[PDB]
Design a protein around this ligand. Structure first.
Ligand SMILES: Cc1cc2nc3c(=O)[nH]c(=O)nc-3n(C[C@H](O)[C@H](O)[C@H](O)COP(=O)(O)O)c2cc1C
Ligand SMILES: Cc1cc2nc3c(=O)[nH]c(=O)nc-3n(C[C@H](O)[C@H](O)[C@H](O)COP(=O)(O)O)c2cc1C
Ligand SMILES: Cc1ccc(CCc2c(C(=O)O)[nH]c(=O)[nH]c2=O)cc1
Ligand SMILES: Cc1ccc(CCc2c(C(=O)O)[nH]c(=O)[nH]c2=O)cc1
Lengths: 313, 313
């Protein structure tokens, strides 16, 4: 039994990869993720220009998960593009490049440049629809007209299959609306659910203080707090986007957690907080654990159960 | 050292109360909450007509919290109004009555009738703005124009101080907008943050099945999953609504979790999942745990720390 799979015209040794932003920012990080047992990797979301990001401390983890307000620190698009074009060893595993411009125009400019590298090398695009707060307007994926604009413009400019990284939704009407938008774009071939649960607040009782510095301690939540949110969003989009793939992200610490993501509809399973905390060895454990649950159940392939979560009546 | 609060022209022995929907549906429930050491109680969110609610199973709990899609089962308004006007012993503690009409007109009809009982007996209204509204549209509090309509009409029809039960938000733009809507209504004297984290999905690995029957397993999340989200919302509203009280609700299992809520700005602190699981005994434990934290830190009253969460630099 091996967990090998094929999608988006690429072959993957297993469905696991990092979540964007974790262990993917520097050349060192990308080489480490490449040397790991993961089935693929994704680069840190990039802007046209390098960014320092927010002041530290900007990430903290606890037994139940993590909070971050990194501020999109990154080495800039030229760096990730050169990684994709010249440094990445595509014989080891596929590469996804995540883009998160501060405007539609910045995204268009990055994707025009990415396209010939995607054609030549097979790098895959994940377009990150979450961005820093701008007072007076919601994050793009929470503004459906802006989301439709971004996707129209990126689709025209890029002209090749790509995916989108989505924040979680919490309302069935929103799921219906969001999926309807994504279904207008045939080049959107995969949807990644979810980004961190926005603007949580962790407080330390002893010190009576928030635990990250930026945004008065408010940041996105990852980890065990978010698993049922992530599963709901994976399944909602899996149901609503039958001609697309869904990539699951959120709360994966174990092969069991991955199993639940795949039951819900996930093709690839991304690991964020648990990867940040445990390091890249986690990928061998997750593989072993997922194969062990499969063997106990008699499943030989992921296809056998992907999306097969049972409902009651 | 004491847990006493005075607010809304009422006196409370301590800040703890049940969350609406837990241990509050029947006369038996309400008498149980009254006999408990809670500082107050709130009645189950009601509609004009009694409702059976959704098919079972419709609530399930786990180590990290709960999921529910109860479907607003309740004994109807006339019952909760009679409890308030004739049966509740107000010398024991104060009562909140929660309403959750299915249209603005149904809420108006209920509040018009509640008003004389509120004035004469001192029952306090909590209007649930997670009331579903038109199917295919978002819940009312996620539709700011509907929220404004509901609050104009209830304000006119009731004419007395009341409070609102809010869903969590995840985007700073929504904190901004929601709080600005609330701040239009001077009779909204308290804001209860938060209702359940909407439309999560819990999946049982062994059975490969969702765990509740309604909504193909999707329901609202409560408990340990949602404490940082709850704390963020209490603090966001505390900071934005300086002329209103904030009540905290979400993830309280211990005196320490209550202490955090209060550092975030909570006046009263409600308890849902942990009360559902542990029963009314939890209130003595929470009181004891909170007084122990206060004594260690030399705090003699709640006011000494309410809203005093520190931020970094
Ligand atoms: C430190 C940190 C940096 C992150 N940066 C990004 C990013 O650059 N792009 C992105 O799409 N998501 C980013 N995320 C979100 C994750 O990819 C992921 O969606 C989220 O952490 C939830 O998954 P988890 O429960 O496995 O942590 C970041 C998360 C963390 C913790
Ligand atoms: C079984 C159940 C029923 C609920 N019914 C109501 C309701 O009728 N009205 C309401 O405002 N919130 C209701 N809620 C939400 C709770 O009041 C509370 O906001 C939510 O459970 C989060 O708090 P917790 O983490 O302590 O559970 C209900 C929650 C549960 C678990
Ligand atoms: C406040 C904020 C800043 C920047 C982003 C985009 C990058 C990003 C970040 C980040 O770099 O802060 N963290 C996440 O959890 N998800 C993300 O998508 C999202 C929100
Ligand atoms: C789908 C749906 C139906 C009815 C409501 C309002 C009552 C309510 C319920 C409920 O009765 O299902 N559960 C909660 O966690 N919070 C609530 O406010 C909320 C959602």
């Amino acid at each position: 039994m091996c967990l090998k799979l094929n999608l988006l015209d690429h072959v993957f040794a297993n469905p696991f990869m990092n979540a964007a932003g974790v262990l993917c920012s520097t050349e060192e990080d990308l080489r480490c993720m490449t040397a790991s047992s993961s089935g693929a990797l994704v680069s840190k979301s990039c802007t046209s220009a390098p960014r320092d990001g927010n002041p530290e401390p900007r990430y903290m983890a606890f037994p139940l998960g993590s909070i971050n307000s990194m501020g999109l620190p990154n080495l800039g698009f030229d760096f990730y593009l050169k990684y994709a074009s010249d440094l990445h060893d595509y014989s080891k595993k596929p590469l996804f490049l995540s883009i998160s411009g501060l405007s539609v125009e910045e995204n268009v400019a990055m994707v025009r440049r990415l396209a010939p590298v995607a054609q030549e090398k097979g790098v895959l695009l994940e377009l990150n629809l979450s961005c820093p707060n701008v007072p007076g307007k919601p994050q793009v994926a929470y503004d459906f007209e802006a989301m439709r604009t971004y996707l129209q413009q990126v689709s025209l400019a890029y002209g090749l299959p790509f995916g989108v990284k989505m924040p979680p939704y919490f309302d069935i009407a929103h799921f219906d609306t969001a999926a309807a938008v994504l279904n207008e774009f045939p080049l959107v071939k995969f949807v990644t659910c979810v980004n961190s649960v926005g603007n949580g607040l962790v407080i330390d009782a002893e010190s009576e203080s928030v635990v990250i510095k930026p945004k008065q301690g408010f940041g996105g939540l990852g980890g065990k707090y978010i698993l049922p949110t992530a599963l709901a969003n994976v399944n909602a989009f899996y149901r609503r986007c039958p001609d697309k793939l869904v990539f699951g992200c959120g709360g994966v610490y174990s092969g069991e957690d991955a199993f639940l993501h795949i039951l819900a509809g996930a093709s690839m399973v991304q690991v964020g907080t648990a990867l940040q905390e445990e390091g890249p060895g986690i990928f061998t454990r997750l593989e072993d654990e997922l194969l062990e649950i499969m063997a106990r159940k008699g499943y030989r392939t992921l296809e056998e159960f992907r999306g097969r979560v049972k409902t009651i009546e």
